[PDB]
Design a protein around this ligand. Structure first.
Ligand SMILES: Cc1ccc(Cn2c(=O)c(=O)[nH]c3ccccc32)cc1
Ligand SMILES: Cc1ccc(Cn2c(=O)c(=O)[nH]c3ccccc32)cc1
Ligand SMILES: Cc1ccc(Cn2c(=O)c(=O)[nH]c3ccccc32)cc1
Ligand SMILES: Cc1ccc(Cn2c(=O)c(=O)[nH]c3ccccc32)cc1
Ligand SMILES: Cc1ccc(Cn2c(=O)c(=O)[nH]c3ccccc32)cc1
Ligand SMILES: Cc1ccc(Cn2c(=O)c(=O)[nH]c3ccccc32)cc1
Lengths: 219, 219, 219, 219, 219, 219
């Protein structure tokens, strides 16, 4: 990654063993559960494109997912190239060349070039650009691997309401419902899919009930 | 987080793998037992709003709780906006814009803006403001998930007094009794809910007994 | 805590995840065995009052003990206030206010105030003052939770002498005998409570025997 | 390794215990699964040739592989010597000698010489040169230890499509198919080797289907 | 401990959680096996007397040993006081007082005084002095807890010679034989205590055999 | 060890708990398997003689090996003294004395002297000299503890060739065959000791086959 030292200049540091191991293990333990994404983003704070490739490449399973991710990355790279075409022909001696999609994705750029872009004034933030493409890809994967439709999350006759809501919102997160929909579901699908007893209590609370109020009601 | 380097300027550091892992694991092991809150506060020492979101987002279960927390955060954000309305229309070139509720909660502000606020002279402490909202939310959750009323904590006939008081005060903490009430209960509910034998000893000590004195008495 | 950076000024650092975890785990594993106290003292080296509260608050069990500790802290705070009354009425603009008991215990003071006191020239060492109160409290707890009187530590007929002395001194430590008494017991209670065979050997060594000499004798 | 200190000069640091242990353990757990290579590359970020030898030498098993790697390294060294012959006869007093193949591989050069080369202006990057030779060798090993031809990866009658694609791409990675071939296989061998039911669905999608589309289709 | 910062002045650092935990665990796992001593010495590199007390106090078992150690420390302290008597009466304002035995052992000196002594020019190395007393004490303990005389280490009829020599030298180390005796035993007791078969081979090698030669002979 | 700080001067640092623990554990787990040696060398990067003694002394078993190592060290020390005799009689006030063998081995020199030698301009590298003696000793031990002659490594009738070559080269490493012999064995003993079926294939490849070619052939 690129970090500020204790004196305030932006320099390259090696990715740490603790970072490498954290990411491998989270993938091992959680696969593409949705909370893996924010972990990825945090573990790659300051990453160069080289670093981002390192983290993805150190993953041993999930190779169907990694191939899908490559496809997504190529799509975004191709759109970058449409928006930001680069000059063919030789570089001005000693000067910074402009990055193409494949330079952002780290496949045609050197570590030195990446550093040069990211520490330019002002920065050409190739690490952040590539990270956004990667996350775009990873979210598609999360959605793909989500095993259950929200329509099939229904409260069991003996299932505590709390346990049911946990299942409901865990499913909506993986299915990647917007926050509008997450904020709205509380007045609709969450009640409809509740068991008869709690459905009756919830119906009676009336509209505009907070989730806290609904959960208290069905305790 | 924002830290002082070894030379005394306030700079942004990446959230560490050890921090990320600590929080995930405490949640995994303790859920919303009350001691989780002070751990959260300590693990997020110096956090930006981005960092606070990271820590909350890396939590994989408890999604009913995380939705309730969003609701709390929106409420506080809306109150911030009532108290501190911001100018519509374009920013003075190169100048710091004022933060709205959603900028404090990190949903409409960039990391760079957050840093700018938090390292201004004097600071607009957006990390601390958002942390307070989050903790407000988390305490509601603790109270919600508290499984037992203090009225149902009664000393067993063979239950050592110490074990009973531990249960009593653990329950009061989760139910979020004030310190007035915690300091007062020792002369009332704690005696009433004791077993017959210890109740008799405690009754005889007379009023004004310390908890240490009560515990010694029923040893 | 407050630390010296690599350049020699006194600055605030976040309490580390390793520190937080160390303390929680020592409490989990050892409860209020006496060696917990020196661990507490070492883990809170440089602590502000905020830090000390953090460490105590992160403890999930032992709530009877934590309530007793609050009582002790209030007692010491009240004695501080008797010895060092503070001016009512408004603070001199920009100047340091004097700390009350509850400011030392971190309940009415901000982190910024605490830092200001502790890094004043010369320091008002609020972290060390509060730590002493806490330890005073913790020692009471150790003594309370000590399960056995020294009078009931007697050497078994087949019990190796070494194992017996270990039990003896472990018990005296928890019961909080002075070092005078620890240094004296070797000529008295330790012999009296030994088994017949070793009692005879010890009696014959005569007075002024070191513990090393006594232990060699009964090997 | 050679690192930038907090002041911006290039200096030698000892290889860390965490690094040493990481590499030994990844080899212990994964042998020459393909994801071991990018881990090696990341764990040896900034390595001198001495460091690279350390990491290889600390491996206790896999000695057939380590012998094959020596052979590869000798081959590359011999090609370096063909391209970059060095002056026989004595060194200019106080001046930097040019590196031979065996100096790059760390077998005839001292740590001091290695440092001198790598921190020259401009650097003679002996660590990166040797790392490339090592990786060249390691990839041969991965391919050698790959247990299954891609022709034998066929979807089971009850095998979920996702699980089959994971097997397929894991195998192609170890067999070291190019990215052209990985990007192409999706329209050919992957369909042919699918089970009858999914083969029919895939055939009907038509050509130009993304892997995401294929995977959705056979869900 | 007292350390050199990154700028070259001698300053006080907090004892680390990793250090505290290392020592507790080595004692837990190895008790007073002889190799515990060099671990103690290394873990307390740079220690103040306060730090040394911390490490000893954090030990929960072995209280007979800790009492014996106190006795040893008092003996050395008393000898220090005989050799280096201090002026009674008040300290020169602002000046360094001379350390008594109990100031070296950290029982009558403050951390600030300890630091003042240890960073004086030239240093009064109170940490190293106290460490020597402690080690003197610990060696007595090792010897006390050594379970077997060297006279009872005899090679079994089916016991490999190597395993026998390991037992022999492990025992001599705990019994604290000098290096003269360790270097000499190879020509005497080690042969005498060997089994008949290896005794015959060893006898025939003749005098002046190295341990390597003896071990090869009885392989 | 002696390290470069973040400002570029050579200073003494305490050996870390992580280093101490790494070495003890590698010895516990691997004994004197050959890969232990390069681990030792790496873990003692920058070591003073004091540090080297620490690492050796913290080893609790293998005392026959540690005695043999002492003997080796005395031999090298005695040869140093033959080559580099030192002046008897008093040191020039304030000046650096020359190191004898026992000063290099850390038995008659102080830490301060060691530091003085190692940070002299130019350095008298006593840490590296002693490390070489130690490694010389350790290699003898590896060879001694090697359980099997290369003549007894023969391929089983159902033993995969790869598994056989691993056994072969693991044995040659412990027996400490030169690289000439390791590079040569592939055309001789490795074929002769192969099973009949693979022996026939190998014989037919003809001379000059790489190990990669041989291994492919017998797959
Ligand atoms: C066809 C294509 C698309 C995108 C990439 C980017 N990329 C790398 O360069 C790399 O080393 N590993 C990667 C792992 C997983 C996804 C993309 C990776 C490569 C090839
Ligand atoms: C409707 C609404 C309210 C509050 C927030 C703040 N927030 C984030 O921005 C985020 O990334 N994760 C969060 C996790 C748990 C609670 C609030 C989070 C978002 C949306
Ligand atoms: C009545 C009373 C007495 C003392 C304290 C001090 N104190 C805190 O402020 C805190 O946050 N946690 C604490 C945990 C355990 C003991 C005292 C704590 C609070 C209340
Ligand atoms: C014949 C030959 C070729 C290459 C090398 C390079 N090399 C080292 O120097 C070393 O110490 N360990 C190594 C481990 C595994 C591969 C090559 C190593 C040595 C000998
Ligand atoms: C009578 C006497 C002798 C020596 C000491 C020194 N000492 C401490 O001060 C301490 O806090 N813990 C200690 C643990 C184990 C041995 C000596 C310790 C105290 C008392
Ligand atoms: C007779 C003799 C030879 C060599 C040494 C060097 N040496 C130490 O000084 C030490 O403290 N531990 C050591 C452990 C294992 C080998 C040599 C050690 C001492 C004595």
């Amino acid at each position: 990654p690129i970090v500020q030292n204790l004196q305030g200049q932006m320099v390259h540091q090696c990715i740490s063993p603790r970072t490498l191991n954290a990411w491998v293990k989270v993938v091992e333990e959680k696969a593409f559960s949705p909370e893996v994404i924010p972990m990825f983003s945090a573990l790659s704070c300051g990453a160069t494109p080289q670093d981002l490739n390192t983290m993805l490449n150190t993953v041993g399973g999930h190779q169907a997912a990694m191939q899908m991710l490559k496809e997504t990355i190529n799509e975004e790279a191709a759109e970058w190239d449409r928006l930001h075409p680069v000059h063919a022909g030789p570089i001005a001696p000693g000067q910074m060349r402009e990055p193409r999609g494949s330079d952002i994705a780290g496949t045609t750029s050197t570590l030195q070039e990446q550093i040069g872009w990211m520490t330019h004034n002002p920065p050409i933030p190739v690490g952040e650009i590539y990270k956004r493409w990667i996350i775009l890809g990873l979210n598609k994967i999360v959605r793909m691997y989500s095993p259950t439709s929200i329509l099939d999350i229904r409260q069991g006759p003996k299932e505590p309401f709390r346990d049911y809501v946990d299942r409901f919102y865990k499913t909506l997160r993986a299915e990647q419902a917007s926050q509008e929909v997450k904020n709205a579901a509380t007045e609709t699908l969450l009640v409809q899919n509740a068991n008869p007893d709690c459905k009756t209590i919830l119906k009676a609370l009336g509209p505009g009930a907070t989730l806290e109020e609904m959960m208290t009601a069905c305790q």
